[PDB]
Write a protein that binds this ligand. Structure first.
Ligand code: JCH
Ligand code: JCH
Lengths: 206, 212
């Protein structure tokens, strides 16, 4: 049984989550916790863009989080989110995902939170998004498919027809020889991993 | 001026991307994102998109005949065909920069165990094809990856949307007992830059030693 709360100034962007019982996902508009008739301001020390104010975040997380909560904060500067992370988080009772926008969230939000709950700043990959929402969708998908009750690269897969546009399915896959099929698939996976992800086998990246 | 076509059995998944686009960029003809239901190209009354894997094993494989027809209609020789897959080359910021100047991206979103390999291999005989992974975790299908790729690419298209960055701060100067680092309020901008550099170095050592 898992509860996921997602906090964002763009709740509309989290709608793809509908595409249950073991898990509940709830999306909260951060602006719900503002008192004035702005969630951001210029950075101390200077620099381009805006930083999200800690005040609004503090009030939201105060209401949503408990000491048992795992607070997840997507950020390009985070620890890497990997399959290992997904397995680890798959047995959590309560994930709260704080989605930033602009140039990110005042660092004190995570620091304050860490005084009463576990906090994980994470990156989903070495590219830059406009905000945390797409990363939340990735994290939710990767985690939920591992929830109870729900290395090397995978090689190529094939299905019918056995010949298509003059391209034939590798004959071994039609042979019904499980050992020969297992061996060919291993070789394909090895080949693919060396070519595309040599780092996985402890070799230099291109 | 970029056209992005996404092909998926879950077109609703891509709807927020389409709403994420500023009207001014669309009206200026800088960008167009179109989403297509793969089932438009199915052959049968059951609208089948998958079938059992040759050689056996778990799950299902998406049909080459259906995908072949879809890409035949949507792609041209100038298309960059992007195929998310856990077995792909890594998608990075460098990739995003490269793809940001493309006239036409087509993103083919798989589900189940993926797409029959002949689809990409056939397409590669007449257009540029890129199989890519967005990170070292497994998703249920290509749609979330497409969202990530579209966002990362389009935020590099003018006017459409190393070391780690260190912490950032804004008002108020004191909050829940935590003061903004005084150096940031010092007006010594050379010192501030050096402080930020050291914060960056420390964070990179702690979180991403692989970058060093
Ligand atoms: C100053 O450096 C920047 C800091 C933030 C941003 C945009 N942005 C704002 C909030 C936010 C949350 C997560 C992510 C993200 C995470 C990954 N792996 N890629 N992108 C990006 C985010 C741009 C630049
Ligand atoms: C047997 O190995 C598997 C094969 C496919 C799948 C699910 N699936 C189906 C299509 C598809 C497209 C992209 C991705 C993806 C990309 C990244 N970086 N993570 N996950 C995942 C995808 C699961 C496992």
């Amino acid at each position: 049984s898992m509860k996921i709360d997602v906090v964002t100034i763009f709740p509309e962007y989290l709608q793809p989550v509908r595409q249950a019982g073991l898990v509940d996902v709830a999306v909260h508009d951060l602006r719900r916790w503002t008192h004035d008739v702005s969630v951001d301001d210029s950075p101390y020390g200077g620099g381009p863009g805006m930083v999200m104010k800690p005040t609004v975040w503090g009030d939201a997380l105060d209401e949503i989080c408990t000491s048992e909560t795992l607070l997840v904060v997507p950020t390009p500067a985070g620890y890497p989110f990997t399959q290992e992370t997904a397995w680890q988080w798959s047995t959590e009772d309560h994930l709260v995902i704080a989605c930033g926008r602009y140039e990110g969230i005042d660092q004190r939000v995570a620091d304050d939170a860490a005084t009463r709950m576990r906090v994980r700043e994470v990156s989903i990959g070495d590219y830059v998004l406009n905000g945390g929402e797409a990363a939340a969708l990735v994290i939710i998908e990767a985690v939920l498919r591992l929830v109870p009750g729900v290395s090397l690269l995978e090689g190529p897969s094939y299905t019918r027809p056995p010949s298509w546009r003059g391209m034939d399915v590798p004959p071994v896959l039609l042979s019904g020889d499980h050992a020969k099929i297992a061996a060919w698939r291993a070789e394909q996976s090895r080949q693919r991993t060396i070519e595309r992800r040599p780092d996985l086998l402890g070799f230099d990246s291109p």
